[PDB]
Symmetry: D2
Subunit: 319 residues, 4 copies
Amino acid sequence: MKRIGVLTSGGDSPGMNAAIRSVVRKAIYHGVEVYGVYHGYAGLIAGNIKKLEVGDVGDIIHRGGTILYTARCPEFKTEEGQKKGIEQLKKHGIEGLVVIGGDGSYQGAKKLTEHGFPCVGVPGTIDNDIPGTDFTIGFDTALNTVIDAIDKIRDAATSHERTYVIEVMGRHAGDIALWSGLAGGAETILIPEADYDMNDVIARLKRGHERGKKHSIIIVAEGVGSGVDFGRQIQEATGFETRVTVLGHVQRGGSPTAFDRVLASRLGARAVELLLEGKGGRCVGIQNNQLVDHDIAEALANKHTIDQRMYALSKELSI
Amino acid sequence: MKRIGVLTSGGDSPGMNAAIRSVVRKAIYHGVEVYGVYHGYAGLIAGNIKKLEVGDVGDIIHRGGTILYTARCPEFKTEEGQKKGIEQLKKHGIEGLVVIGGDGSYQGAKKLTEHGFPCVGVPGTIDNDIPGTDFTIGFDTALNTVIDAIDKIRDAATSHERTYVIEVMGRHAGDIALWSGLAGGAETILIPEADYDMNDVIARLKRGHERGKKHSIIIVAEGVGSGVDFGRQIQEATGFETRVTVLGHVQRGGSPTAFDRVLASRLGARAVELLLEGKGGRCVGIQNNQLVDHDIAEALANKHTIDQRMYALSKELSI
Amino acid sequence: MKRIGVLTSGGDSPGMNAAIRSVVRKAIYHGVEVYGVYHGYAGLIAGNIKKLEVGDVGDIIHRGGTILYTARCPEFKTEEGQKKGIEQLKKHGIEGLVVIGGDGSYQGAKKLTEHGFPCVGVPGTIDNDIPGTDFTIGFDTALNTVIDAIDKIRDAATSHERTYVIEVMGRHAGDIALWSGLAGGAETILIPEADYDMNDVIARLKRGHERGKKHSIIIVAEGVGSGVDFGRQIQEATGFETRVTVLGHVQRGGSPTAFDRVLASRLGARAVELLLEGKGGRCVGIQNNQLVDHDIAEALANKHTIDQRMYALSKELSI
Amino acid sequence: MKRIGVLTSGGDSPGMNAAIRSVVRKAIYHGVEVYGVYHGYAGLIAGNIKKLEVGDVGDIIHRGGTILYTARCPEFKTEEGQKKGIEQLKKHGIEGLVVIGGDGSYQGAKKLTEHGFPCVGVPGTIDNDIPGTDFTIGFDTALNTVIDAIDKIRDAATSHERTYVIEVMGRHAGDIALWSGLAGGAETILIPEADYDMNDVIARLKRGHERGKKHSIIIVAEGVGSGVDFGRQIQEATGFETRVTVLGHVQRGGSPTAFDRVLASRLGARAVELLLEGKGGRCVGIQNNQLVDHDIAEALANKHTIDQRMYALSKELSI
């Protein structure tokens, strides 16, 4: 290849910029031009495309967000969009595309290669529910954003306000809740991939009050329900005053952790390697601490699971 | 005075430990003994009182919360409560008290001196709504906790999710909302001390969208209402996807900023100085960047205000 | 005034971007156009000038550094360079200039104003070493950068390595060292504005050890000496294992604190108001918690001081 | 087992507290009592032993340092101290020991099993220089401390001062240098595990400057040499203004990251599991993203390595 392109699709995730940098620099190191595609798939369709110089990715490795911007475009999930997309790619002489984003981005990448255009997926999202990788770029940053909240709550807790609910992200995936909950010392974690009984939650609460536990912190993934709702139920059932934090999109934001920039730098460069060596239709990832790649269609067919042993352990340690 | 006591009352505030450290160290510096009263006025009534050595306040200056704990004690707002407390103090040879806490905690200080126990109040709250001081210990830290979330929101924003409502604390005081809003570059800031109009607010959003503003941020003081409600009304009226963050008690936790440690160190020491000077029934503060102290009753009789010029400035800059 | 300019000069200070944002927005809000001057005075001379649209300062309020850049321009110290500069301004239809930076930066404003060109100076540096203001934009952020380091060192302290030296910036002023050392609970703070006795330092250190103080931390303003030197003298005199941290340029970097953004916003805005009100040759500032402005040459005549009572206070608390 | 003990030995590492909490809770969850050994192997000999109640490891999971304190004990390096300690253990009825700490603390765990006393090693150190584990507790936290500095330097860089040297920790391991380097976008990284050429280094810097690179960041592991010298040699040879930050012990301090709290929680628990299964004489770790344990002797046999491809990658991306 002589010229590839790169874009970001889906929700923002910390480390997208570090991934864009790696894609751009790796390619330039091998004498390949990199063209930036702005505003996700919609921008591709619209021909919002502009060459990225070696210096255009300077001083972004440590920046949250994405200098290429993002969008949600379901039109690229159609033949028409696929067709317009490829016209713009060809018209700008782009021979391969690196797509950095979530679930929806991989579907687009799969279609693209089914249409004969070489494309590689890079997992850039916070909730860690992309197949073919143990970790997604942004997940680690998000966990740290969450435990910053938990830690402050531990300071703020008093004798009559010792009961706290924190609603985190993860509509279908409980990874954020599980990891941040274990990292935060959460007494109870409500995820989708495991079931909960309110009587147990409430009992854990009372058990801990009795034994002298200074405070109880409850993590609730948005996919399970609303923090405000569980807070009300919990106060109503126990008469403990219960305060609620709803983090929201704060989790999608901020400067990426060390681990996120390293992962993004490694995976972005791999994606370039794969384009240059004639592979396409793949997604990159990290599994068992080793760099991997997979046929996209094959990877999308794998259900996402959490570490149940990790879930059980978080219950054991809050005694 | 051979011996004094120190306690914390009201909601937790970042920097209470710095102020505790200061009280202990200043007094010990002048040869005075210092006793910790744990769990605030409730703990005082209960006689929960232990001597604090010079090293009992090592490694707390940078810690959030309060090593002495707080409580709500309505009982202390009764003659029989003010009696058992006076008794427990005399039992312990405690001749003077430093009370670190919110506006509420000052009542106990007032009465205590009227019954012949010198007491000085030190303003410890994030609300910044204590009289006789431009700033309360904790306010600056709370502000940095808020803009942390606002900054992350800036990274998380996309073309489809570009409207955000963040609800902050401050029961009746818009200080947190106004300062965080200005420093965060909020488009709109809703505070109880200023009339607002939801139609003008919505006009502002639309105007920003028309001129290409990437995202719009709305700060809401809890005194004005729920972030959830304002968000829902904004999305319903405009069709703009609107996300909501409710920080809650996060704002009361965390390690105190430099400003808060410094302010706490100076107010704390000033309080010891006042007792030793034979003063009593006073509250300390900082006004016009100068350390001050006022009679408690005269101070608590002035209504709190915010800087209206700063409010208008925030609207000007956020075009 | 139809058109004004803004530039940054001196070392980088956190909050310069917030001030740039405020200058641009406040002027645009009154229908004045703003032109950016890149690379400071050197840039002004070279005609490195470009218009800033309303959205060009979007998403900078929270960013460290300066999007305009800085540049030590000795050429502007000469009456020749001032001529080429005023030439480029006139050439670009620029009627007034806001200058954001440290000392030297103000000398430029004066001389431009001696030459009848209206210029307002805005205090942007971490040193707190600028007349006509109690605080400079960047100082607060720098303090928090320092105590972050001091805090981490508290965790890393052992019985063996109980003694630490940290060298902080300040140039000729002790503000950073004084405020950070107090904020961080330093046993000893060495600043230019106050006499010190290395023997008393040695004894203070031995005393601390005798009484079980888990660690001693010594803060050294760079304008007093080298952290590595002092660290030697101390290990040699006491046989205590002494470790030295030198922070260096880290103190000029990072995202501005809330107080810095607020100061930056208010002062940048005031600067613009002064230009439109037909003033010139003024510098803005905050004194006694009030917005002020002064004649440059006059303010420049004041010698800088620190609060000696705070310094005293610092010794009293770290026994 | 009906009762076990736990201690920390070696340098302080963020997450030692999370590990301690884990050991304690996991044990108590299976009906086992846990006793704290204070001040490392010296305290085991001196008999500094006290029981740890379930609430005694509350509010420590997010704290840096170690509540058990640490120490250097050469006396335990002997068969006299080893018997003295085995004696102190039995005197309290402790059937098993968990040792959380660095490479040397494992040597101690080896002997104790030799002498018939079941012991497990938990990798607590920032330098990542401990066999039988891809990552040590504290490593991730250290990396983030380092890039916090690198990031701020990025802001502080100007056209005149645009070359920076940061010396980081790692006496014989370049993991910190390597990972923080890659994550922070360092141009050159100097580690023991890789031969380097000051010439290629100077040449890199010069090419960077020619192509318009804004600033150059050089990371130097302490094992390789001194940051101050490297900055002097580099300035001399280039006349490029070169600033040096030496972080020192701040790398060992701070609240643990999410990954470190998770890793500490998982490795601590497994250590307890092993003791209770009767499998003393082992160390736990994470390898290829799975929990492992090894005989200590067999583990200590392996040399420590880094990933040469990551070192190479880091070169490719900083062109």
